[PDB]
Amino acid sequence: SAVKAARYGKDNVRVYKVHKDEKTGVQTVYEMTVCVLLEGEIETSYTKADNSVIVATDSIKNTIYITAKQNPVTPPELFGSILGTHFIEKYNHIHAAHVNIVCHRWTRMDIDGKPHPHSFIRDSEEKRNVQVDVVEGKGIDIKSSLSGLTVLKSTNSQFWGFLRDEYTTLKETWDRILSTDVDATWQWKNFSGLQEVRSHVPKFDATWATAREVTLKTFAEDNSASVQATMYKMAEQILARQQLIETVEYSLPNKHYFEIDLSWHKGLQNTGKNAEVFAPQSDPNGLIKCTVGRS
Amino acid sequence: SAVKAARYGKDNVRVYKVHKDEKTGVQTVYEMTVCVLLEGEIETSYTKADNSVIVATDSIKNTIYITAKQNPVTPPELFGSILGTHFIEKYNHIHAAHVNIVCHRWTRMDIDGKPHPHSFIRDSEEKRNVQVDVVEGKGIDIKSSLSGLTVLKSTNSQFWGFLRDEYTTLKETWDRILSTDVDATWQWKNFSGLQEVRSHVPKFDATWATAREVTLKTFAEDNSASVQATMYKMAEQILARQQLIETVEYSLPNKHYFEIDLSWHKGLQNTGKNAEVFAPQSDPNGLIKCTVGRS
Amino acid sequence: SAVKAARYGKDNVRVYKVHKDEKTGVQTVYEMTVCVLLEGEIETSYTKADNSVIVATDSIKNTIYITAKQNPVTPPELFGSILGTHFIEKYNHIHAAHVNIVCHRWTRMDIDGKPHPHSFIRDSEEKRNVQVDVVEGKGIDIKSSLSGLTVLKSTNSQFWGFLRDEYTTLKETWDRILSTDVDATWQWKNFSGLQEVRSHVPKFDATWATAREVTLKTFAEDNSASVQATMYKMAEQILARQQLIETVEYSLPNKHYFEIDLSWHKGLQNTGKNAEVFAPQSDPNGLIKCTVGRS
Amino acid sequence: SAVKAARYGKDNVRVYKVHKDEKTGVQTVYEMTVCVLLEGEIETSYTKADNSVIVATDSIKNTIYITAKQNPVTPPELFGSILGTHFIEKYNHIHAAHVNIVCHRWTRMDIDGKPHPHSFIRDSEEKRNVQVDVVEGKGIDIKSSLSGLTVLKSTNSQFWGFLRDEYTTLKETWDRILSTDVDATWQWKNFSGLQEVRSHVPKFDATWATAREVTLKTFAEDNSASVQATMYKMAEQILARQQLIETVEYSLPNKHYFEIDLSWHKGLQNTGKNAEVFAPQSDPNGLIKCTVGRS
Numbered sequence A, B, C, D: 001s002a003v004k005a006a007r008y009g010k011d012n013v014r015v016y017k018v019h020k021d022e023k024t025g026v027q028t029v030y031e032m033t034v035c036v037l038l039e040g041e042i043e044t045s046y047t048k049a050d051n052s053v054i055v056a057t058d059s060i061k062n063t064i065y066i067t068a069k070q071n072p073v074t075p076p077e078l079f080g081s082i083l084g085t086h087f088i089e090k091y092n093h094i095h096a097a098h099v100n101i102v103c104h105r106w107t108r109m110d111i112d113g114k115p116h117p118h119s120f121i122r123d124s125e126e127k128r129n130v131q132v133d134v135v136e137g138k139g140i141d142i143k144s145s146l147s148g149l150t151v152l153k154s155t156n157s158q159f160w161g162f163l164r165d166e167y168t169t170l171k172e173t174w175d176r177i178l179s180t181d182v183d184a185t186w187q188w189k190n191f192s193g194l195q196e197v198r199s200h201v202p203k204f205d206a207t208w209a210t211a212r213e214v215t216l217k218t219f220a221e222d223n224s225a226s227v228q229a230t231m232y233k234m235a236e237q238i239l240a241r242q243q244l245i246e247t248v249e250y251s252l253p254n255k256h257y258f259e260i261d262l263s264w265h266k267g268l269q270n271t272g273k274n275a276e277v278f279a280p281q282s283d284p285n286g287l288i289k290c291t292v293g294r295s
């Protein structure tokens, strides 16, 4: 036998950083969870008990903290690029660094209508993430995403005209609930290295904001023919608004809310136009995916 | 042997309800998870296989839906009181109904600075809950709460002057991070029945808002001597602002953020006044509780 | 206002301990999660910022480790009693210690039909727990439990003869699936102190084993009239087999498995006597409870 | 823009099936969670609101139940192959079906030393899984796995000789705890279709058993130089014992257990050879991966 692929590192590294403005007293906090996995000429650690090729995962952890101390942690695309570049430059035999960052929300509190200088709220479990793959000789590949954005619309979703055969029981509808947890990813053009990533830094926060805004507005305003049709509209708009993105991918569950027929009880009418009370279904769920690129 | 206590019912009943304003087109959604457990002259179901005394848990589920269809589901204190009253009135042999409701957030979306008529976001996993105990001949006992309100302040928390002995390693501090998940409960005066609950309906949303506002403002503004001292201030203010509450209870974890000494690496200074990068600790956690009443 | 109740301490303290037999080489591992909350003359920490009365929660954590180092961690009833006694004896002003222990399974592996001296498997998420309340002047109150014991029987469960009215849709059945997650608690006679707890040490593991065995055998063998009737049989047997228990409490979800009518598809018969494929329901669930004592 | 990739279907479909032997009375249960995602000439559902190409996800759900009713659900490699083949054969325009199955444990209970005919226990959260990709014109690709197999050894793990530089603080060790959650995958040779899968049916359960046995024995017996070295030994043995496997992949967290220095308290010795009480660390964790193939 032989090693065909290998990577190793430290996962689930929780990191907080604070910035304190001396002049104003305003503090700003950042919290993330980081994973770094390395690849390179490491196969002998597996095949021959050769630990000399292993940068210890404990040392990878230390390096995450040190890097956070000495560099910006925002935008996460930048932090991940700095961190991954460090490993492939520092260690001759390490040839790729795969950096995943989950950013947690700490939104500044408003108290009596004024932003508070040092108090924050987790206003959502929605995350902003990056996957940064730094590959020696092949630049930096970045996938940015938002996930855990949970939404519901109570009308202006439809689903009719689907295939009907002997496996089909679903009734056509022209008015249903639609609820999902949005997972949206935008894949950047390959960057040649850290200098190029740094040259585009403002685009990272701007493109996250665009993706989020397009997602919410399109969800809210599209009289949806299907999850498929609505998500495609989101992707096409994001591509039209950032030329440095190559593809946009959505993965959307259809979190079903079922009508409840109560007519067996005193003729109570709770279906169709009279539907008021529904049963949210925990499982199963539709799962709809697509990757959209440029024509 | 003999039955000393018994209760039974249906848990984890997910319920959605929509209201549609015909004139304006504005829709409003409510989602909760409901548990109803009944007590009464039911011991023979346990001791003699006497199912005649059992209102089936499936029927309890049906009744939750029917009640939601025919009554307001908001405020949850009211819905729970209506629901619990139903069981003790409908069934001679059922003498108590214990209703727990967890309310999930569906906050109306703003799109282009305008509230959208039928689109919503789960803007937090924070919950609003009630426990409503309807006991035949003994009125209605209501505990209202908020939970899962996750906050962090980056300074203006202290902890010094605690007991120091041979088990103590903790260093005194005059400047630390404080983060918690707030669980706050206000216990209402006993209500004589449904009429009295209904007579106080506006106070339920108003008192939830007061509790939340006091919690956030006190957290943000108190230069905290301890979790103990800060939570007491919250409780005393809530009692002062709603005379129909008898007690306020807080349960607060101290979700620790530890400094990271990096001085072993090139003399990097990251402790005390120089602390920027911290290690959030998943466990263990302090857990601080108190119940405050009127003197 | 005034403090009506208060307790505080450290939660979620993970603890592992190993025993190494020098002669045989056999190692044995224990892992638990511990919570200790203290009560006493501590109100001024809440009302006056008086930290002098606070045994720091960090120190409580240290004390858990130290106590585990110097004493047996098994049975958990004993460890919790030692730990709680320490706090009320060491600190004049601390008058109660509430110790919760969750014990995690590390079952010795068999390799090639032989017990391995130092390798273990988590063979279940089933837990063994204790709640030990040590109250100065009032002895030691112990509740022992097993939880997370997940079982299913595919027949020999029935449910008929329940109340039927205008809220009832459930069909009577003489053959259904029954599945639950067992949470069973046995409450010991008050012990006067540590000496008395120690005098009964062998009874703790023996009574846990009895409770588990009775639960499994009764579940498997009872042609169940209801969850109520079956759980009562379990409780009565446990009381009959340990005189030092005062009560036994069960809390059992009825984790429903629904038939699926497939007759709309080519007349396929999958209900009643022909039921083969079922839909496990995540929610809602029946929840059935009782506390049984001696007549 | 244009669709570059798309798939859709139903996730989180819970399925139970019972087999009842009429002669013996012995019943046997199977429970799984199924996901089916389809690909094909479906792009117009995304780009033109063309639902005519959509086999409804509700219909996919129905089809899972129907298929389970009319075919074996074990081994999961077979069920997934039957299910995926159905979709690509039934629907001209569907060209791939991706079937994921998670199998849940229901192990027959022993009562008084005898296997019970219809009572079962969830004896572990360990799962057995398959990913079956049925691609029209390109056969059936199967990845089998076990996951959630949680183990610990208390000695006979080492880690020394790793790279040491200015980022390194980790001390070399010749005796540490090693604990992990095993995720192991074996990738089968491409099968030409259902007939070929069926021809190898006994190999599926046999190879799962081999993988599990090799994992446990190697974990228990290897005086481990690193997670890397130990996992490689497991993979090489599995490849040597099933020629129809092409690769074996492991993904192993290193779930750290840290020593606790207690020497600050009365000189208590709890490190090195005296280490008895440890602090299990929830995060971060090492994460070690490799894919092994034939030389």
Ligand SMILES: O=c1[nH]c(=O)c2nc(O)[nH]c2[nH]1
Residues within 6 Å of the ligand: A159, A170, A225, A226, A227, A228, A254, A286, A288, D008, D054, D055, D056, D057, D058, D059
């Ligand atoms: O938007 C939807 N897309 C689908 O593919 C689908 N299939 C259903 O059964 N419902 C659905 N709703």
Ligand SMILES: O=c1[nH]c(=O)c2nc(O)[nH]c2[nH]1
Residues within 6 Å of the ligand: B159, B170, B225, B226, B227, B228, B254, B286, B288, C008, C054, C055, C056, C057, C058, C059
């Ligand atoms: O606010 C705090 N209260 C406490 O009781 C405590 N104990 C610590 O170790 N830290 C603490 N911080």
Ligand SMILES: O=c1[nH]c(=O)c2nc(O)[nH]c2[nH]1
Residues within 6 Å of the ligand: B008, B054, B055, B056, B057, B058, B059, C159, C170, C225, C226, C227, C228, C254, C286, C288
């Ligand atoms: O064992 C059962 N006990 C109950 O109280 C019950 N109620 C149902 O609807 N099903 C039930 N099954």
Ligand SMILES: O=c1[nH]c(=O)c2nc(O)[nH]c2[nH]1
Residues within 6 Å of the ligand: A008, A054, A055, A056, A057, A058, A059, D159, D170, D225, D226, D227, D228, D254, D286, D288
């Ligand atoms: O088995 C191990 N492999 C590693 O790569 C590693 N790195 C550490 O810091 N510890 C480790 N233990």
Ligand SMILES: [Cl-]
Residues within 6 Å of the ligand: A254, A285, A286, A287, D057, D058
């Ligand atoms: Cl769907």
Ligand SMILES: [Cl-]
Residues within 6 Å of the ligand: B254, B285, B286, B287, C057, C058
């Ligand atoms: Cl604390």
Ligand SMILES: [Cl-]
Residues within 6 Å of the ligand: B057, B058, C254, C285, C286, C287
């Ligand atoms: Cl039930």
Ligand SMILES: [Cl-]
Residues within 6 Å of the ligand: A057, A058, D254, D285, D286, D287
């Ligand atoms: Cl590691």
Ligand code: NA
Residues within 6 Å of the ligand: A087, A088, A089, A090, A091, A092, A093, A094, A095, A136
């Ligand atoms: Na390199």
Ligand code: NA
Residues within 6 Å of the ligand: B087, B088, B089, B090, B091, B092, B093, B094, B095, B136
């Ligand atoms: Na009554």
Ligand code: NA
Residues within 6 Å of the ligand: C087, C088, C089, C090, C091, C092, C093, C094, C095, C136
């Ligand atoms: Na005392």
Ligand code: NA
Residues within 6 Å of the ligand: D087, D088, D089, D090, D091, D092, D093, D094, D095, D136
């Ligand atoms: Na096809």
